[PDB]
Every structure is written in structure tokens, then in C-alpha cells.
């Protein structure tokens, strides 16, 4: 009989029911338990800034198997470490390690992208330049 009560003095039980069952759809859980600010070192940060440590390359997953051009960064605003990427074939050596870098996220919401294991971030700004420039040779990289 539609085991949700319907009698014309319901309002209270309706509210408590719906607001003890919001806790399924995660998006609500992340917003209100808020750990999207506590952990997830990019504190709701549509970007961040950090510095490079030393370039590494990790094996990829199933059938698509190759070296996938990986980077190791430590942020500055909190002091936390992640692993990022370089698109646009070359320009993996625009690194010049100990140069800073401006990171941004993928699109799969911290869940991994494509084939890569344990990586979350592109790079669109770095050391005052945007990779779209040099890889199309619009600007020219100043050195640090």
C-alpha cells in the first residue's frame, strides 16, 4: 500500500524520511560531509599551483599499453603531492624540473581518466606560460 504514510497529518514523517534518505546520492554526501575540502588536496580548487620533483613514467593498463608521459608534482597551497600529465606530444621536456607549474583537473571528477593508473591532472598553465602557446609556438618559454 505504498509503505510511505499518506495520512493528512504526515508532514513530519515525510521530512524526516526524505532527509534521512538523502544520504544515498553521493554528491549530497560529498557536499555536506564536506571532505571535498578536508581531504582531496585540491580544495575544491578548479586549479592549483605547485612545483615539479622528477619526471616518472608508469605502465598503462589493458589492451592500450604504452608509456603515457607522466609527471610528479607537489602543490604549494597546502603542501601535497600528486601525479599529472602532459598532452600534445612534445613539451614533456618543457618541464625543466624545479620550475613551478599550474595544474588543473580532468573531467572525470577525480576518478581516473582513460587508461592511466592513479592520475588526475592535466596542465594548461605553467611558469607563466600556457602549453597551447609553445606547442603551437605562439609564445616562447622563459626559463626559471
Amino acid at each position: 500500500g505504498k509503505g510511505k504514510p499518506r495520512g493528512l497529518n504526515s508532514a513530519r514523517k515525510l521530512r524526516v524520511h526524505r532527509r534521512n534518505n538523502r544520504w544515498a546520492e553521493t554528491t549530497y554526501k560529498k557536499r555536506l560531509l564536506g571532505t571535498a575540502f578536508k581531504s582531496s588536496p585540491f580544495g575544491g580548487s578548479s586549479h592549483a599551483k605547485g612545483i615539479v620533483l622528477e619526471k616518472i613514467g608508469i605502465e598503462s593498463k589493458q589492451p592500450n599499453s604504452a608509456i603515457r608521459k607522466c609527471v610528479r608534482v607537489q602543490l604549494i597551497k597546502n603542501g601535497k603531492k600528486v601525479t599529472a600529465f602532459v598532452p600534445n606530444d612534445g613539451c614533456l621536456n618543457f618541464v625543466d624540473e624545479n620550475d613551478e607549474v599550474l595544474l588543473a583537473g580532468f573531467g572525470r571528477k577525480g576518478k581516473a581518466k582513460g587508461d592511466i593508473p592513479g592520475v588526475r591532472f592535466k596542465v594548461v598553465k605553467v611558469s607563466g606560460v600556457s602549453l597551447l602557446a609553445l606547442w603551437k609556438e605562439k609564445k616562447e618559454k622563459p626559463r626559471s
Binding site: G57, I67, D89, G90, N93
Partner: protein
Amino acid sequence: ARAGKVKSQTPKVEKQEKPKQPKGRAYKRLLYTRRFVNVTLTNGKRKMNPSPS
């Protein structure tokens, strides 16, 4: 590491001075006239991409 190669082997072809595409209002007028005047000379279906090859 061994990356950065494709642009090394790429042919370095250059641009072609082709007469400007009349960017702007002319562009819409041209797409209209080309697309929707000539129903003849069909290509099985109207294949928009007929090549010289």
C-alpha cells in the same frame, strides 16, 4: 623520453595562399547558395566531400 618524435619526422609542408574565405555574413550566404541550389550531380547520396582522387 624517446617521445618528441612525430614532429621530427613530419613533413614541413607550408600554407597555401588561397583566396580568403569571405568570413562573416558572406560565409552564411555562401553556405546557403552552395548547399541548397544544385540538387543535380548526385553522388549516390549528396556526398559533401567529393575529392580529386
